[PDB]
Design a protein around this ligand. Structure first.
Ligand SMILES: *C[C@H]1C(=O)[C@]23[C@H](O)[C@H]1CC[C@H]2[C@@]12CO[C@]3(O)[C@@H](O)[C@@H]1C(C)(C)CC[C@@H]2O
Ligand SMILES: C[C@H]1C(=O)[C@]23[C@H](O)[C@H]1CC[C@H]2[C@@]12CO[C@]3(O)[C@@H](O)[C@@H]1C(C)(C)CC[C@@H]2O
Lengths: 124, 124
């Protein structure tokens, strides 16, 4: 989907990539409005479980997002940032999608995700 | 080949990608060691001048890089951060390269450079 990077190697200087799997999830404008899969979330397969960076959806007033926990023993709601507007070439017609960074995600990851999206998916 | 994304809309919530140009520069252990071109810098064409985000290069021990003023009035020596090490895959072999960021480059851009890089190029 979109390949981030991590500083590994003996001196914490080797660049190893990491692809990012994606999955569906629920978003809404409040916590109860998250009732149905209206969004695509970019995550990373860690050891503590699954860690979410940003959200991709057609709606523009979204504020929240709904995820099972690791092994779905409960449920988590994370606030989204104000959305980034862009235009991708979906294979069914050019489509306006919005990008939501999870609130808290740091700038270096915000930038890896963008330049990974700028290079891979076609923007406009 | 390394793109970068800018937020530039009516409310600056608008994703706009920009291709970063490149050029050969001179670098070295210290300011005076900078003589011959031994690296490649990535830059962005603003109005008024050029902005160098990072150097790519075969040598470590690069602490400095030198740049002309574009007007003739002189030269500019920028200090480099510690290098990130990474390995691509030329047909000659594994090519060890050393990626330098400019001291002060904000983390957001570091991410865009790195995520832009890990997709386009063939990291292992
Ligand atoms: C690969 C290099 C790199 O990008 C680092 C260092 O220069 C070196 C290893 C660790 C990186 C930092 C500190 O400086 C960096 O240039 C920088 O991009 C990293 C930040 C984002 C500031 C924080 C993690 C690490 O300390
Ligand atoms: C597209 C969204 C976006 O990415 C924004 C917003 O949440 C929204 C619009 C602008 C950026 C951001 C403020 O918050 C952001 O999360 C952040 O990435 C931006 C910076 C890096 C802190 C600086 C520019 C800007 O102030």
């Amino acid at each position: 989907a979109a390949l981030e990077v991590l500083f590994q190697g003996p001196g914490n200087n080797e660049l190893s990539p990491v692809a990012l799997r994606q999955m569906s999830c629920a978003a809404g404008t409040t916590q109860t409005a998250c009732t149905d899969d209206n969004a695509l979330a970019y995550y990373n397969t860690t050891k503590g479980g699954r860690f979410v960076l940003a959200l991709l959806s057609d709606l523009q007033d979204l504020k929240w997002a709904r995820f099972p926990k690791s092994d779905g023993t409960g449920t988590i709601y994370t606030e989204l940032e104000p959305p980034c507007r862009f235009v991708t070439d979906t294979p069914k017609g050019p489509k306006v999608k919005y990008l939501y960074f999870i609130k808290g995600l740091n700038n270096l990851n915000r930038g890896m995700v963008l330049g990974s999206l700028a290079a891979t998916v076609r923007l406009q």
